[PDB]
Design a protein around this ligand. Structure first.
Ligand SMILES: Nc1nc2c(ncn2[C@@H]2O[C@H](COP(=O)(O)OP(=O)(O)OP(=O)(O)O)[C@@H](O)[C@H]2O)c(=O)[nH]1
Ligand SMILES: Nc1nc2c(ncn2[C@@H]2O[C@H](COP(=O)(O)OP(=O)(O)OP(=O)(O)O)[C@@H](O)[C@H]2O)c(=O)[nH]1
Ligand SMILES: Nc1nc2c(ncn2[C@@H]2O[C@H](COP(=O)(O)OP(=O)(O)O)[C@@H](O)[C@H]2O)c(=O)[nH]1
Ligand SMILES: [Mg+2]
Ligand SMILES: [Mg+2]
Lengths: 430, 430, 59, 430
């Protein structure tokens, strides 16, 4: 019951899913052949959340994979746990977008999306009670940031009451791999605020910083960043698949973390994270988890959370632990940092406990906090956008496929209005 | 399901095509007979049982080079009737190969192009090679580009032209046809890469330590650059790049698409292994002005956008840590309206070595394609050379008597003046 | 500015003669071909008229 | 229980009959002696024990060719007294072979035809071969057709006539007897196929790459076409076609039954295997105007109906997918009153190769028999050639003195004018 379907688009989203599904399968004891080989009874009670049942007793994820080029899905199939995905759900084009948002949203993405919407509708109509959808995509690419966001609007138009999740990677100015990143980032943020019920920003720069400083491993690769993102993704829905002292589905988090409908851009972090050589030194206790959870360097975004004030915060503890300690520590982390918490909403931290810890760990915490410090990312994105747009650089590529500069002006104005009205509440006082 | 077709016209084009086609056959394990004793599909086609046929066509009006090809070790590889050959050479006269003898041959080439294109299903684009300072090369390249631009339309075409050196020259009349061919491909080619011989001679002398190089050594380096550019289409990589994802990242405006390339490392086996060849040092060497593949000084102009490809065991975090260092340096400055200018690609397959060649085997390499404002100097010096002889109308009778009109020389001069004014207008800060 | 090349007036005149001779040679080919087709008709009409007269005489 | 009888008259007819009879004997495994060391029954008959006798008769007034046949390796195959031979040649005079010497020979031929027909039980029809530009060939063909049309009536007769080339000619008087023979077979033959030599010379030169062809190379291609046409009667196939199923599909009106053929692929073993020879490319090559077996341009007229035969491992869905592509093209247009114009046949037996010949062994082939409005040009040019000499009554005395009346020339001219008017009347849209 109350299950969700997985939809991913683009190369970055496909690579994120290729590790997210591996993590989920390892958590539930599903072999790469789809056969259950788990140890505990609880591993099968709520498997309908992510997995479907077919004849022969094997399980198949309800994931939908889409891209405008076939290479990435032809590569993910040969990887481990690549056989679980149903071949029918693979939809792809023969041309690609070339990191051009217009091509992936107006000319090419519009004709292809009917086929993927057909299978999306097939998956949603069938399921017992829908909880919602979760979306993984990147804002630095053309086909992803175009087709995914248009699909968001199409899904929202047909299921207005369901919940919608988006895990979005925004292009940081530090590690830049594409010159046209500001254009399709700014165009995508315009559409994303209007339809997504929840959004979670993730930055490659913050992932590299975490890998270099906390784990202290010499050579980070995309596999480590994907693993961290996958652990963070799994931590959110853990209590929906396992029993606990205070169960809290996604809708309950939506109620408690979004004060106003347009303020739904969160930054997350996962604890504990320790190096291989120091994993024996540390002792896992609730104070040790909560001190690392609110650490500024532990956030999955380069945004500095002590440059603003938290509107609200959430924590999803895992493992068996006493609730009194959790509540007193949450109170203590809020009394010692009163300057960084907005004062006109008292008791702005939500807590939840799940009795099933991750495989290999005795305690774990997932942190989701809505803070005013996120304005800095939109500020720098808009700064680069307005630095590049004033000369109409690279504009002809977009304008040759039916798009105009008016949609750029409206997007810039709406993004600046969002930036302004997000900080409006930072200076608000009672 | 992704394909590309390479066009070779003229003596220089055929001699660099031979150079790239030993390398591709060696890299995909195909013997010179064409027989193996799913990545080949980008350049080759399967015949059903046994041999592979290249997706390439060789053009020339002068039969000597084709006859040399049809008797060497590669006689069995190419299809017998795609090596189109003429009888009479254009003899460095541009008007000949555009108005007199090229027209009767161009129809067969277009028929061959159609017969090759109907086989491909996912055609990415075309590649073309031609030495600019010759009659048949420049003239037939211009005519083929003009026919293809209307037969196919929006398909992408890439041109690896070899412009004459600043002072070193083999002919005496090459500025005329160089200017005319630049006129022709200015409005007809999506990408043009600079390849003059003097810079590559200096590269060989300084790094490879060869004091008597021949054309084969130059063509092998060009072949390595081509392989590095197209590796991402036929090998698995953490950060892929497609051909269609260029005009959205390197071409700010439709007129400006001339850029100059560089490669690193270039080193011989006698002293390669004494140093570690870290990613930082190779990416520093790639940006050195003395390692430009065209004899132009990047210190004399701004950068617009840099697209640079890695291959081997490179890790993205090390790439970011090196892009930061380059942004730090005060001798390299980017244009004002471009905050981030780097597009990064990472591939896993290390560069392959050709036996008996110059380059050694290494695990890391970098190839950069950079668009800079300093390229206007070659246009200015070619224009100055052209004006000196066009003042007295020297050598014009060899062109007027081959069907070309008198006024055709002036409008190429006007288009070059327009291009030079445009390059100055773009490079000024706001 | 532009291009006032101080070329010899004799060479400029010779280039103009070469251009006019090229144009005149090009014009002189095609007209003859079209004339041959026009001539090619008329013959069929003369032949067809002779044929019709003789078929009429033979009933 | 299905049979067919082939008639060979004249030097060209006998020389193409030899060509087809090596091929049939090779295809059915019969040695040149006639001995095998149930499909043979279409062309052969069993003698009770041992050898097989062809269902063919050879006719000629000039004894040289028959004497050459009766001494070659095939002396033991043919029945000794079905090689009817005369003493005096007609010497390119049509009136001779229709009024003077052919009448005394025609009775023996008709007796042989009766003796062969009484043996057959399921006689499908007759085949006849004759070069039109000769005296005995055209005259005896006309007389035999006229006798057969009344002796048997509704039995189908097929004529593989070889008309003279537009400009290339061996005789000087061949238009006269060509026009007279066209008059004779216009109202007496059910199907006539165009076979002029110039088109086949161009085919050999372009594809087979033979610069000095002889008549044998032409006759082998004609034999291959005949074998492809009649394969469906003696081999199992997914979509069979009979001879009697032609006038219901290719002949819109009783007067219009002249059509022109084409064959594909035509390629030598030196470069055949380098390309895959897909069904789409061969069916594209078959419709190329330069591959017509008669020197006529199909682009100058509409199509009426296309009957085209496949053989090998071709699958019907691939055939349909290629018929759609041809219907798509804008350079091929069908007549208004014919929505569908294709009749498709598929056979399993691949074409057989003759040792020492030109064609290589392939698994797929296509033979098309197409009726088009453009055929009127050959009639118009033959008429123009005829009128030039008939204006002055040249060479007429050679015909009036052989028993023919003066007025016989005029009515053939009137029938050709009627045919040309009919072809114009049919091709106009409603
Ligand atoms: N890099 C490189 N350049 C070459 C090579 N061969 C010729 N060139 C250049 O080509 C220019 C002249 O054009 P060519 O390619 O030699 O001759 P072409 O293009 O066939 O034109 P034609 O003279 O009419 O035959 C010269 O100035 C050379 O610099 C080569 O092997 N490598
Ligand atoms: N395709 C082809 N045509 C031939 C061949 N031999 C002769 N012809 C054609 O036949 C025409 C003349 O008729 P022939 O067959 O040679 O002689 P005939 O039909 O026996 O008539 P007579 O001259 O009276 O013996 C010539 O114009 C040739 O084009 C041949 O072997 N192949
Ligand atoms: N975490 C992670 N990020 C990736 C990976 N591959 C690419 N990216 C990011 O995705 C961005 C490029 O997105 P792109 O591949 O063009 O998206 P697309 O246009 O939808 O295919 C780069 O800036 C990378 O930082 C990966 O395997 N893992
Ligand atoms: Mg040459
Ligand atoms: Mg004869």
């Amino acid at each position: 019951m109350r299950e969700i379907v997985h939809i991913q688009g683009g190369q970055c989203g496909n690579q994120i899913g290729a590790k997210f599904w591996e993590v989920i399968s390892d958590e539930h004891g599903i072999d790469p052949t789809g056969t259950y080989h788990g140890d505990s009874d609880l591993q099968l009670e709520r498997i309908n959340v992510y997995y479907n049942e077919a004849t022969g007793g094997r399980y198949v994820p309800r994931a939908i994979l889409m891209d405008l080029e076939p290479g990435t899905m032809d590569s993910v199939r040969a990887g481990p746990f690549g056989q679980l995905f149903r071949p029918d759900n693979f939809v792809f084009g023969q041309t690609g977008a070339g990191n051009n948002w217009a091509k992936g949203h107006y000319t090419e993405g519009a004709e292809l999306i009917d086929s993927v919407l057909d299978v999306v509708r097939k998956e949603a109509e069938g399921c017992d009670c829908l909880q919602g959808f979760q979306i993984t995509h990147s804002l630095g690419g053309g086909t992803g940031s175009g087709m995914g966001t248009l699909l968001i609007s199409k899904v929202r138009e047909e299921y207005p009451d369901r919940i919608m999740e988006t895990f979005s990677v925004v292009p940081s100015p530090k590690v830049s791999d594409t010159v046209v990143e500001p254009y399709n980032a700014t165009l995508s943020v315009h559409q994303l605020v209007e339809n997504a019920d929840e959004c979670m920003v993730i930055d490659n720069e913050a992932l590299y910083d975490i890998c270099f400083r906390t784990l202290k491993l010499t050579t980070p690769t995309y596999g480590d960043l994907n693993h961290l993102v996958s652990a963070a993704m799994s931590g959110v829905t853990c209590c929906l698949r396992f029993p606990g002292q205070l169960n809290s589905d996604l809708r309950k988090l939506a109620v408690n973390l979004i004060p106003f409908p347009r303020l739904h851009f969160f930054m997350i972090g996962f604890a504990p994270l320790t190096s291989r050589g120091s994993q024996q030194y540390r002792a896992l206790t609730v104070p040790e988890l909560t001190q690392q959870m609110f650490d500024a360097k532990n956030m999955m975004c380069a945004a500095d959370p002590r440059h603003g004030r938290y509107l609200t915060a959430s924590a999803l503890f895992r493992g068996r632990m006493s609730t009194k300690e959790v509540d007193e520590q949450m109170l203590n982390v809020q009394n010692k940092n009163s300057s960084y918490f907005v004062e006109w909403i008292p008791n702005n931290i939500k807590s939840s406990i799940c009795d099933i810890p991750p495989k290999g760990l005795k305690m774990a915490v997932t942190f989701v906090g809505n803070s005013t410090a996120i304005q800095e990312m939109f500020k720098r994105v808009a700064e680069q956008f307005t630095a590049m747009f004033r000369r109409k650089a690279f504009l002809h590529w977009y304008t040759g496929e039916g798009m105009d500069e008016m949609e750029f002006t409206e997007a810039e104005s709406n993004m600046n209005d969002l930036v302004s009205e997000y900080q409006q509440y930072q200076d608000a006082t009672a | 399901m992704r394909e590309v077709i390479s066009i070779h016209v003229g003596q220089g084009g055929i001699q660099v095509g031979n150079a790239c086609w030993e390398l591709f056959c060696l890299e995909h394990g195909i013997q010179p007979d064409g027989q193996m004793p799913d990545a080949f599909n980008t350049f080759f086609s399967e015949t059903g049982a046994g041999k592979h046929v290249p997706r390439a066509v060789f053009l020339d009006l002068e039969p000597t080079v084709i006859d040399e090809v049809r008797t060497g070790t590669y006689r069995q590889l190419f299809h017998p009737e795609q090596l189109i050959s003429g009888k009479e050479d254009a003899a460095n006269n541009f008007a000949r190969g555009h108005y007199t003898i090229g027209k009767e041959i161009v129809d067969l080439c277009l028929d061959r192009i159609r017969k090759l294109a109907d086989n491909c299903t996912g055609l990415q684009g075309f590649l073309v090679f031609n030495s600019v300072g010759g009659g048949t090369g420049s003239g037939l390249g211009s005519l083929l580009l003009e026919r293809l631009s209307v037969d196919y339309g929006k398909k992408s075409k890439l041109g690896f032209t070899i412009y004459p050196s600043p002072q070193v020259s083999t002919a005496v009349v090459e500025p005329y046809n160089s200017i005319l061919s630049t006129h022709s491909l200015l409005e007809h080619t999506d990408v043009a890469v600079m390849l003059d011989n003097e810079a590559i001679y200096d590269i060989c002398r300084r790094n490879l330590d060869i004091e008597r190089p021949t054309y084969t050594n130059l063509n092998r380096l060009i072949a390595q650059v081509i392989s590095s550019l197209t590796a991402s289409l036929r090998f698995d990589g953490a950060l892929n790049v497609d051909i269609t994802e260029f005009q959205t990242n390197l071409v700010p405006y439709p007129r400006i698409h001339f850029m100059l390339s560089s490669y690193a490392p270039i080193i011989s086996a006698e002293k390669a292994y004494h140093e570690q060849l870290s990613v930082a040092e190779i990416t520093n060497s790639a940006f050195e002005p003395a390692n430009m593949m065209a004899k132009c000084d990047p210190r004399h102009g701004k950068y617009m956008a840099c697209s640079m490809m890695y291959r081997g065991d490179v890790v993205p975090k090390d790439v970011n840590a090196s892009i930061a260092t380059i942004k730090t340096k005060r001798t390299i400055q980017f244009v004002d309206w471009c905050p981030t200018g780097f597009k990064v690609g990472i591939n896993y397959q290390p560069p392959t070595v050709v036996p008996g060649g110059d380059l050694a085997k290494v695990m890391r390499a970098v190839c950069m394609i950079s668009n800079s404002t300093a390229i206007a100097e070659v246009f200015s010096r070619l224009d100055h050379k052209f004006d000196l002889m066009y003042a007295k109308r020297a050598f014009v009778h060899w062109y007027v008597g081959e069907g070309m009109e008198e006024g055709e020389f002036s409008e190429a001069r006007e288009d070059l003046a327009a291009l030079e004014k445009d390059y100055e207008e773009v490079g000024i800060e706001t | 500015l532009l291009r006032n090349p101080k070329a010899d007036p004799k060479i400029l005149k010779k280039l103009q003669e070469i251009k006019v001779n090229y144009e005149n040679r090009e014009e002189k080919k095609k007209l003859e071909v079209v004339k041959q087709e026009q001539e090619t008709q008329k013959e069929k009409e003369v032949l067809r008229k002779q044929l019709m007269r003789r078929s009429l005489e033979q009933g």
